Amino acid sequence: TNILAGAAVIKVLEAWGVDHLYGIPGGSINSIMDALSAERDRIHYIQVRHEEVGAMAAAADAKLTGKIGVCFGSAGPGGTHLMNGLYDAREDHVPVLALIGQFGTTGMNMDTFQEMNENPIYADVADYNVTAVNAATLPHVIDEAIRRAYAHQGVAVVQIPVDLPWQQIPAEDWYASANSYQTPLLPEPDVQAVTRLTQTLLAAERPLIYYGIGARKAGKELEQLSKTLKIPLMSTYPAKGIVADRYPAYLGSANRVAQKPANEALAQADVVLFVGNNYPFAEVSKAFKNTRYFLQIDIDPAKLGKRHKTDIAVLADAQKTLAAILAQVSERESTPWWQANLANVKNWRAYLASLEDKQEGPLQAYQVLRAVNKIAEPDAIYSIDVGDINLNANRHLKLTPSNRHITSNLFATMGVGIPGAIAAKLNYPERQVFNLAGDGGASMTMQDLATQVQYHLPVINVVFTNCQYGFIKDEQEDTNQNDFIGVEFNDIDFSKIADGVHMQAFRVNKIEQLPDVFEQAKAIAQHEPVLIDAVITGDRPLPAEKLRLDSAMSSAADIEAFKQRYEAQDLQPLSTYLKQFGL
Amino acid sequence: TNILAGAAVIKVLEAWGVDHLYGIPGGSINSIMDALSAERDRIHYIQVRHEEVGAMAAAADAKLTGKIGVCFGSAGPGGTHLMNGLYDAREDHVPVLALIGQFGTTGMNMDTFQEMNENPIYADVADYNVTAVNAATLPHVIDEAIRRAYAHQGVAVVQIPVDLPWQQIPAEDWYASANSYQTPLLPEPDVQAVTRLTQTLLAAERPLIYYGIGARKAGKELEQLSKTLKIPLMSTYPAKGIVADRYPAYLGSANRVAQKPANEALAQADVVLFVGNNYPFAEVSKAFKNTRYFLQIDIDPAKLGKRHKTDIAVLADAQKTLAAILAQVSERESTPWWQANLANVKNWRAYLASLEDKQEGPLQAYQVLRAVNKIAEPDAIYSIDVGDINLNANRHLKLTPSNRHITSNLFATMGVGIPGAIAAKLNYPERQVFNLAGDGGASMTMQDLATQVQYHLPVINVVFTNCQYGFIKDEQEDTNQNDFIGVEFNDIDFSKIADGVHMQAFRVNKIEQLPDVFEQAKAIAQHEPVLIDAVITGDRPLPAEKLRLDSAMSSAADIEAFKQRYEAQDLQPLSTYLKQFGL
Amino acid sequence: TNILAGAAVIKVLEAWGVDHLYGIPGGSINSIMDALSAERDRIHYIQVRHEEVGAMAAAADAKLTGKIGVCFGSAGPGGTHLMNGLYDAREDHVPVLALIGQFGTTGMNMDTFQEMNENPIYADVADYNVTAVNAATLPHVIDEAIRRAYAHQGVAVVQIPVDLPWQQIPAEDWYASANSYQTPLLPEPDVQAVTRLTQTLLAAERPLIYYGIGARKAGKELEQLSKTLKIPLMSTYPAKGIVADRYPAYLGSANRVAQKPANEALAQADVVLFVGNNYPFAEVSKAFKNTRYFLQIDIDPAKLGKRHKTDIAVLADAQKTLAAILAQVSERESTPWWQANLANVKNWRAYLASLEDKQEGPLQAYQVLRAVNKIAEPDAIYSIDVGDINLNANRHLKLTPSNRHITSNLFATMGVGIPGAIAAKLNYPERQVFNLAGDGGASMTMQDLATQVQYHLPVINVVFTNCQYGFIKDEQEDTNQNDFIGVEFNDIDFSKIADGVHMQAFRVNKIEQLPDVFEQAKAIAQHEPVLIDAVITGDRPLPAEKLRLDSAMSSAADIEAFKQRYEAQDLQPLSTYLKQFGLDDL
Numbered sequence A, B: 001t002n003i004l005a006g007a008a009v010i011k012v013l014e015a016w017g018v019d020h021l022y023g024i025p026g027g028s029i030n031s032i033m034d035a036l037s038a039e040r041d042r043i044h045y046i047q048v049r050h051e052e053v054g055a056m057a058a059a060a061d062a063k064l065t066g067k068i069g070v071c072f073g074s075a076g077p078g079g080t081h082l083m084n085g086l087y088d089a090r091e092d093h094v095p096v097l098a099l100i101g102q103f104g105t106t107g108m109n110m111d112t113f114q115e116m117n118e119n120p121i122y123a124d125v126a127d128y129n130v131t132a133v134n135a136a137t138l139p140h141v142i143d144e145a146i147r148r149a150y151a152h153q154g155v156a157v158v159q160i161p162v163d164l165p166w167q168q169i170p171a172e173d174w175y176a177s178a179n180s181y182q183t184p185l186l187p188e189p190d191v192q193a194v195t196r197l198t199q200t201l202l203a204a205e206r207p208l209i210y211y212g213i214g215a216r217k218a219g220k221e222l223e224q225l226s227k228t229l230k231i232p233l234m235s236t237y238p239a240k241g242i243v244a245d246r247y248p249a250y251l252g253s254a255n256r257v258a259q260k261p262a263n264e265a266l267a268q269a270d271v272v273l274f275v276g277n278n279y280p281f282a283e284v285s286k287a288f289k290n291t292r293y294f295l296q297i298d299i300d301p302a303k304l305g306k307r308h309k310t311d312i313a314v315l316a317d318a319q320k321t322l323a324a325i326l327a328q329v330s331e332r333e334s335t336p337w338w339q340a341n342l343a344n345v346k347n348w349r350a351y352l353a354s355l356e357d358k359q360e361g362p363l364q365a366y367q368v369l370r371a372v373n374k375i376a377e378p379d380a381i382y383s384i385d386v387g388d389i390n391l392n393a394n395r396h397l398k399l400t401p402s403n404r405h406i407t408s409n410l411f412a413t414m415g416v417g418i419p420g421a422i423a424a425k426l427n428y429p430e431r432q433v434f435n436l437a438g439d440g441g442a443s444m445t446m447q448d449l450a451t452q453v454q455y456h457l458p459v460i461n462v463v464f465t466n467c468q469y470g471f472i473k474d475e476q477e478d479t480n481q482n483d484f485i486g487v488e489f490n491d492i493d494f495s496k497i498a499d500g501v502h503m504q505a506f507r508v509n510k511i512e513q514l515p516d517v518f519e520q521a522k523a524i525a526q527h528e529p530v531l532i533d534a535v536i537t538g539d540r541p542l543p544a545e546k547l548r549l550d551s552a553m554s555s556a557a558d559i560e561a562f563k564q565r566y567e568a569q570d571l572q573p574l575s576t577y578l579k580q581f582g583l
Numbered sequence C: 001t002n003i004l005a006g007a008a009v010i011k012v013l014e015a016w017g018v019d020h021l022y023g024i025p026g027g028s029i030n031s032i033m034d035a036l037s038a039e040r041d042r043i044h045y046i047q048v049r050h051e052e053v054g055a056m057a058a059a060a061d062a063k064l065t066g067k068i069g070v071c072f073g074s075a076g077p078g079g080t081h082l083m084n085g086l087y088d089a090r091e092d093h094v095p096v097l098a099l100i101g102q103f104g105t106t107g108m109n110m111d112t113f114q115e116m117n118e119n120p121i122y123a124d125v126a127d128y129n130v131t132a133v134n135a136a137t138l139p140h141v142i143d144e145a146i147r148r149a150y151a152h153q154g155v156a157v158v159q160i161p162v163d164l165p166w167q168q169i170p171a172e173d174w175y176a177s178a179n180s181y182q183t184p185l186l187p188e189p190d191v192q193a194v195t196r197l198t199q200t201l202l203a204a205e206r207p208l209i210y211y212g213i214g215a216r217k218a219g220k221e222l223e224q225l226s227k228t229l230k231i232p233l234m235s236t237y238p239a240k241g242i243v244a245d246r247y248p249a250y251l252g253s254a255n256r257v258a259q260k261p262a263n264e265a266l267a268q269a270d271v272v273l274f275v276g277n278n279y280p281f282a283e284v285s286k287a288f289k290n291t292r293y294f295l296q297i298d299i300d301p302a303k304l305g306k307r308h309k310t311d312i313a314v315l316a317d318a319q320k321t322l323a324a325i326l327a328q329v330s331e332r333e334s335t336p337w338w339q340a341n342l343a344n345v346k347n348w349r350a351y352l353a354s355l356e357d358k359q360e361g362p363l364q365a366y367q368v369l370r371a372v373n374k375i376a377e378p379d380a381i382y383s384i385d386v387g388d389i390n391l392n393a394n395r396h397l398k399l400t401p402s403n404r405h406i407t408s409n410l411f412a413t414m415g416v417g418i419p420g421a422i423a424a425k426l427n428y429p430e431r432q433v434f435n436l437a438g439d440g441g442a443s444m445t446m447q448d449l450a451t452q453v454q455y456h457l458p459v460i461n462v463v464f465t466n467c468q469y470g471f472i473k474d475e476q477e478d479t480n481q482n483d484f485i486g487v488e489f490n491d492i493d494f495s496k497i498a499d500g501v502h503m504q505a506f507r508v509n510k511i512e513q514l515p516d517v518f519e520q521a522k523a524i525a526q527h528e529p530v531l532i533d534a535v536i537t538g539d540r541p542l543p544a545e546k547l548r549l550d551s552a553m554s555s556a557a558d559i560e561a562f563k564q565r566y567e568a569q570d571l572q573p574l575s576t577y578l579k580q581f582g583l584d585d586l
């Protein structure tokens, strides 16, 4: 007895627990489609409107759940449309399987219609990249691709000649290795290295703990170390929410998608504990130029001493190590450094609240995000696009350990807001999901609003319409000699786009319109997707990387101009608080 | 004295006559943007909403004019979004320059934000693919890229570290080699090979001339050879219009994007003259299995004998060679083969007119295309997307040598209708331009309807809304065991999408609505873009590759079913006409 | 009726006129081997000892005859050993087909022994690079590969799963397109452009004609234009021999593999006619910085204005264009520029002759090459390795249009001497063939001396043993601040290496030993290969790019030292001759 090789392939996906997958059919992938069609009760095919959205959504599946995302594209242009999502998966180091259609083996290398050597297309993006040439081994090739994508935390691509999945293979021969999958049991953290790290951290005058998403399991330990030891916390932007934003000694993130207290404290710190962190600005921004001792905890040998010369680098799990530090320390009294940082945070949060709390007038991004906070459930998931929204969401969203947020962290491809929200709702139908996107990024993937409608995925889409590539406009202001170019453009009314895909929607341009529109959207999203198009000003958000508040550092004229432009008259530089507490 | 290297780069583009270029800015390409900004009077930057549209439009520029198209993308995701247009340019062998942003040289290889080794990304698509590393040589690298793209008829990609274009270089050193550019003067066509080819063609009983776009300069000679010698003409789909469609011995194209008379005649022909033709279905469809002698004229040695064993292959220009054949032949009387083919064409065109000429009822693609014909100017340009529209446009558009039509011929990427129309209008502001697209393809690039609005490009967009990937649905009907999957989807109202980008638009779903809506669109398009969303039936167009009309070939039951489904009761098989004239 | 797919593939090779091919067998290519075995009366397999030599020989085949060269390698390491020869073919733009073994389709992607995805290995080097996946289409894929390698003048690679050539396919379906082959059309010169070019050339005060191997069919026209118009000639190194070296207005080549008169004249010229030339040093050496007008003739649009901005560019065949120039000019009187160059060339040739004509004492490269000239037939072929030998052979070999010489022109892979000579003797059994190689380069491919013995290929191998990478030592002298490193090494006695592979050989270290050894070698090579291991001094050849002879440019002390080191006491700078005829050292 026999099975179609394509049926076996789908049974390999099922064995690995793949719930849903994305793509667009074509003749060159119609034999995989045929196998999917017979298996609708167990694996859910999501037909997207552009293959990039399928690839992005597959990456987001893995970001959210840790479970391999799966997408496909038809030969030639279907597969090449996957690229921005495949590169997102590579750079955000999440497991994705991509299946690429190909001409049957009898026509390959004949220069026939939309027939090319597809293997070189995927060689750079992929950890594993093969053209299948045999039906009987095709289940194994798919199984190998999955196992490698997991092991290597990246993209596996298989090009499949369309004849192979329609061939019969022996039913009893193929298997999946999902049953062997497991996670490692690790030794405890290296005892003598962690005692020595702890002493250096505690001997510091101006310590900081600076964590990334490698510390995602360690929020409790981070907050209790901070509180016990009187050591402020700062994070990478993606690590926002691992410790609740409300924690009074959470400084935020550094650089540009950043918060003032974090930049200022980092410049003064004498010892940094760098935990589960691969901050890509470390060298180029000279972040640690002032730092006396640099301590690291990371799971990956490839990261040890990577971002700065490191005094002690412990190769270990973040949680296990932070718990072992906590077990060997006890209460320290409040210090001037602690108090200064607490005061600086309070001043900064008062500034952000002042922006949020306006009640009437021309709409700014700040109030839109307040309105999101007001309708957000405590375990909401945020799919965030790329641009000023990362900066503004990082400052204004009030996250806790119960939330999740995702974006394209390092490749930073625009357009991910829509697909990330699709993936979030497919994985978590009972959780509230937002897509927060700028107009530029929403434009790029707008057609897949129709996918939210088609699959009845009740996403709350919020488009920030400034008629600009605002993040880039600000860059041009900073660097370019000549006039702005390519950064200001003509309006798109996304409420009308939504109507065109048969999604309920609203457009607002005044602060006073927000509460009722957001309450209506909250309610619609109990059953159907909704879109709010928020027409916002072109005001530049405060640049945390170019602060002009300290009269020892900047001219009075520069400070007065900065305070005026950024509504920052009541912000004080960290040096004010350092002086206040005697530093 | 010095010049900024970026300014010199723009002066190289200007020297080569580049009128317009496409892309989206980013920090990693802001120094090229800065140079563009100072040169708005001479080179016109078109800000697109998705970089794929810029790449597609650059390819279309070259398809239309023969002059290198230029696009750019920012580091990482900007550039990877170009791919579908770059592969279109490679496969349609037209010259395109792509500029890719990159991190400055001081941060390359530091694993910083959106910083990667970009060179491997482009290695497969590109004829020339380099990362610039020096400012003083950067003008030369761009000049080299252009000269190679032209010489090699393909894609040149340059990755540009953002620091380089802001560096000063000596003003007097750089140059462009546009002044050296020229086209070759060729020998005349090989005398003895062309006399011998001519004899074999004339000795045939059932000759055909089968040309592609390499014969684009030879329409007059093709038609006069056909008329003088009594030899029917057939073409590749892209070669439609080189000879007017109204010519009574034009059979159409073969395979699927095809016309019945061409498929039927090709199966009977004893001698084929294959001219300027690289038909990719030749081998896989066994097109020439019956052919006794196969004669070829091509300019490219790589094509000689490529598609079939060739009796005589002349390496020469198509026009020069066809004129030399014409100069050595004279009138032949009408033959039975000629008469049979003329009768078959007349029968086929009566069938297509019967579809077009319905006046009321549920709208089909056939009447939409009649309505296009009725408002089309004699020199209109058609940008055609990918799907059933290629099949239907090929049958119904009434083209002449004065028209142009473009699509993604061989890569066949969906989404090209919008960008191709943008490029057409930018090159030919005084010519009428259509974008004919299916709903699937229009969806993929829909956001760049806003670019037509922004640049006041008066395209007539016609969307064929069947709520299907119809071309693929029909494939699944033919091959798939299990139920249709991924090929039927939820409506998008493109009149509402158009309203959202501030474009006038109409939606129609009945035949009787067409005349007034098309007349309004014709008039609007004297000054602004317009969109018609044509809601059409799901009727399958007649499959020219699966004819069931000949009672010696097919069962009576199969013929009756085919005639019913395709409204083909009055079509006769070619054998009827062959018999009528005694063959 | 059926044929094995492998048999059909070999038939495709035969239809395309392939006489011989190179490689080393392995399990992963044994089905092609089986087909070759059956066809050994009609196509000839040459088993090499390292696959790089097969690839290099295939490239050399194409360089010599214009016929596609064919090589193969087994899966994994057999194929990756081809690389240096494949990049040689790419960079020297000659057609080569490379067949790469692969695991059968039933074990591909199983991570079995020697089994990998081979397609990405070849993506950069190859114009065409495919893995075959079907037996019935395999003959076409090979046919396509050959046709594109020719049309695109580069490398085509096909990875062949070993099961496919053992499958039966229909006998009647496959074909080769060899019957349809043609070479690219030769474009013709625009009449008015050629007249304007001519007018500019003839208005020049200090003209030069500077040709490369694109002018290989135009030697008669080049030499007659030079004589009629009184315009000196210079060439790229590879273009040596297109015009006989004897011609008194042949200046040589520029840069380093160069002759003094060419460098000096190029620095003074006001108009250059750059014909069939892609000189890779143009920009980096600032060759044309002071050239007033630059006139170019090339058949490739990718080259026009590449190396300097053109004043007139002609997209046409060199010999047609040069003939059209010649047809519209008449004899001109001598000029001061002409006579200054003629005198400079005599002075230079007298210097080279002085080095060649020593009769006793420590052996130098110069006398070895004189001894080669003394036994060389007028239609000899030279396969030249990479290093100082390019420099010395360029100066001393006395070539004419009847000769051929080849090296790795642009990739410049060492080791090509031995495989190029193998190829030469296979293609030209009745012509004398030399392999001129340094010790470093000969070392790299030494084992394939055995191939010359095995196939009875009577090459005259001459190894220049300095116990150095001399060309690189001289670079370190010029740039490096610290002591020499990696450039001086232990001796290898290549006469003993030759004995080990069963080749007759000689070792010499004194000038007076040369005549008798070279006569013996000439006679041995009527029937069998031979090797001469010439133990030469570590003297640096005169650096034509760093002349120290003109007291207007250089210190007396530096001139003194130059003359002493290079035995150059009798050399004059070009300015001496310019001044004699009334011209300024511009």
Ligand SMILES: Cc1cc2nc3c(=O)[nH]c(=O)nc-3n(C[C@H](O)[C@H](O)[C@H](O)COP(=O)(O)OP(=O)(O)OC[C@H]3O[C@@H](n4cnc5c(N)ncnc54)[C@H](O)[C@@H]3O)c2cc1C
Binding pocket: A092, A211, A212, A213, A214, A215, A235, A236, A237, A238, A239, A253, A254, A255, A256, A257, A258, A275, A276, A277, A278, A279, A280, A297, A298, A299, A300, A303, A316, A317, A318, A319, A386, A387, A390, A407, A408, A409, A410, A412, B113, B114
């Ligand atoms: C438009 C845009 C702008 C941005 N600019 C900023 C910015 O200004 N500031 C900013 O902070 N970010 C910014 N980013 C994000 C930035 O590019 C990086 O992605 C981010 O700073 C790196 O975060 P990370 O170190 O948490 O994650 P990763 O880079 O994923 O690193 C995780 C680290 O944790 C380690 N690890 C994993 N598991 C464990 C474990 N169990 N125990 C220990 N170690 C472990 C890994 O080995 C790795 O070193 C921006 C993003 C966007 C979209």
Ligand SMILES: Cc1cc2nc3c(=O)[nH]c(=O)nc-3n(C[C@H](O)[C@H](O)[C@H](O)COP(=O)(O)OP(=O)(O)OC[C@H]3O[C@@H](n4cnc5c(N)ncnc54)[C@H](O)[C@@H]3O)c2cc1C
Binding pocket: A113, A114, B092, B211, B212, B213, B214, B215, B235, B236, B237, B238, B239, B253, B254, B255, B256, B257, B258, B275, B276, B277, B278, B279, B280, B297, B298, B299, B300, B303, B316, B317, B318, B319, B386, B387, B390, B407, B408, B409, B410, B412
């Ligand atoms: C959805 C879709 C389906 C399609 N299916 C069909 C189909 O069923 N039928 C069909 O016909 N097409 C079809 N096509 C197009 C098809 O893929 C090929 O692109 C087309 O058939 C090849 O046309 P061509 O030979 O004219 O062009 P090219 O492939 O561009 O070849 C041009 C040839 O002309 C030669 N040449 C160039 N200049 C000269 C000169 N001056 N003199 C002499 N020779 C010269 C070239 O060397 C080359 O061989 C389809 C397209 C799409 C989008």
Ligand SMILES: Cc1cc2nc3c(=O)[nH]c(=O)nc-3n(C[C@H](O)[C@H](O)[C@H](O)COP(=O)(O)OP(=O)(O)OC[C@H]3O[C@@H](n4cnc5c(N)ncnc54)[C@H](O)[C@@H]3O)c2cc1C
Binding pocket: C092, C211, C212, C213, C214, C215, C235, C236, C237, C238, C239, C253, C254, C255, C256, C257, C258, C275, C276, C277, C278, C279, C280, C297, C298, C299, C300, C303, C316, C317, C318, C319, C386, C387, C390, C407, C408, C409, C410, C412
């Ligand atoms: C160790 C070493 C050092 C070297 N250093 C030197 C050096 O110092 N000096 C030196 O001169 N060389 C040197 N070379 C060689 C050098 O690298 C180049 O290969 C050589 O200078 C280029 O020669 P070319 O232009 O003749 O050949 P190619 O680069 O092959 O160019 C031939 C040109 O002719 C054109 N063409 C072809 N056919 C025609 C036709 N029918 N009509 C018109 N145009 C045609 C082509 O399009 C092309 O532009 C060295 C080689 C080695 C091994």
Ligand SMILES: CC1=C(CCOP(=O)(O)OP(=O)(O)O)S/C(=C(\C)O)N1Cc1cnc(C)nc1N
Binding pocket: A385, A386, A387, A388, A389, A411, A412, A413, A414, A437, A438, A439, A440, A441, A442, A464, A466, A468, A469, A470, A471, A472, B024, B025, B026, B027, B074, B077, B078, B081, B114
């Ligand atoms: C244009 C752009 C950006 C503008 C985004 O404009 P938006 O309108 O979406 O957002 P806003 O800033 O106006 O609120 S940010 C981005 C950087 C971070 O890389 N780039 C570059 C960019 C360009 N193209 C793609 C596909 N992805 C990218 N990241």
Ligand SMILES: CC1=C(CCOP(=O)(O)OP(=O)(O)O)S/C(=C(\C)O)N1Cc1cnc(C)nc1N
Binding pocket: A024, A025, A026, A027, A074, A077, A078, A081, A114, B385, B386, B387, B388, B389, B411, B412, B413, B414, B437, B438, B439, B440, B441, B442, B464, B466, B468, B469, B470, B471, B472
């Ligand atoms: C889905 C699809 C097609 C459906 C196009 O649907 P449309 O709705 O645009 O057109 P219609 O047929 O319904 O009128 S045709 C195409 C083939 C020719 O390649 N494919 C495959 C395809 C898939 N993805 C991209 C980007 N380009 C492609 N060509």
Ligand SMILES: CC1=C(CCOP(=O)(O)OP(=O)(O)O)S/C(=C(\C)O)N1Cc1cnc(C)nc1N
Binding pocket: C385, C386, C387, C388, C389, C411, C412, C413, C414, C437, C438, C439, C440, C441, C442, C464, C466, C468, C469, C470, C471, C472
């Ligand atoms: C080492 C060396 C050279 C030394 C050759 O030493 P030889 O001993 O062969 O020659 P000689 O100069 O001593 O007479 S020349 C060459 C340059 C031109 O590229 N290189 C670099 C080189 C290094 N490795 C290989 C395979 N090929 C090369 N060309």
Ligand SMILES: [Mg+2]
Binding pocket: A438, A439, A440, A464, A465, A466, A467, A468, A469, A470
């Ligand atoms: Mg915006």
Ligand SMILES: [Mg+2]
Binding pocket: B438, B439, B440, B464, B465, B466, B467, B468, B469, B470
């Ligand atoms: Mg459709």
Ligand SMILES: [Mg+2]
Binding pocket: C438, C439, C440, C464, C465, C466, C467, C468, C469, C470
């Ligand atoms: Mg040596």
